[PDB]
Design a binder for this molecule. Sequence first.
Ligand SMILES: COc1cc(Nc2nc3cccc(-c4c(F)cccc4OC)c3o2)cc(OC)c1OC
Length: 302
Amino acid sequence: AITHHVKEGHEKADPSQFELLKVLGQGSFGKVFLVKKISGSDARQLYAMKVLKKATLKVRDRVRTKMERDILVEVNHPFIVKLHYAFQTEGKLYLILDFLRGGDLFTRLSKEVMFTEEDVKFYLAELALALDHLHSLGIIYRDLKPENILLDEEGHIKLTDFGLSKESIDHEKKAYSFCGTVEYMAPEVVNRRGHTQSADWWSFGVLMFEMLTGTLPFQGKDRKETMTMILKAKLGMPQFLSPEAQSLLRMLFKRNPANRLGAGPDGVEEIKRHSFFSTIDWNKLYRREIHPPFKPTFYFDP
Ligand SMILES: COc1cc(Nc2nc3cccc(-c4c(F)cccc4OC)c3o2)cc(OC)c1OC
């Protein structure tokens, strides 16, 4: 067949269609900005714009930005951020995502020091459904940390940053990269022996421990000491934690990933049916029908 030398025409989304309002923070590979759509059907809509600079030279950040885009296009879940646009210019990549009005969980955690078990149960329950959705698509999230847990105006969670995630992890395939925040890494991630979706359940345990106590379970004076402390996994259990919380933590903190809660044949069901989550109606939770525990004039002349 002879090639028809003609070009398809399309009106392309450009960064000029989004008014820059302020810098929201720093994502895995670039800055995130609050922007407002100028034109089209979604005019006046607020979004979060993630920008990757000098994209042509930053080859590893570029391949992961493309993977992040691909993950976001594939996912359809209540607790996972929606991607609205993805486009590029010379040396710049852009992702236009939902703007989460409630800020991140780290800001709330730092202000409160620690959360009640009722609050932790809520956050982890929505997170377990989001993680399981990613696992069903062959994805390892890998970058759990409270900075990556965003809240909407209602107080429900959203996972938003997939820059450090891993795709195509199914059957006997393992990932070997050493990326993410060290304090949340599973032992198999730290010792470079290969990791799968079960590494996310160790991270889920770290996040749980931090939310309940205000501190990290395995941490040393520097990143190298934290690494060897994760490999030893000698956990000092705070005595204000309930028996249900202590059971879940010990079942998640299994150094052998094959023996970790959520790694058995029932997958996420092993976590969903744990006593710590016994008051959770998982169907109502997925339907966003569970009230979040936290939701993020003087003149008088009658
Ligand atoms: C990180 O701090 C804030 C973030 C938001 N909202 C928000 N929606 C987002 C959608 C995608 C990404 C981010 C994000 C970000 F904006 C900065 C750093 C990391 C991020 O995600 C892990 C998002 O952040 C909203 C805020 O206040 C209303 C924040 O406090 C300044």
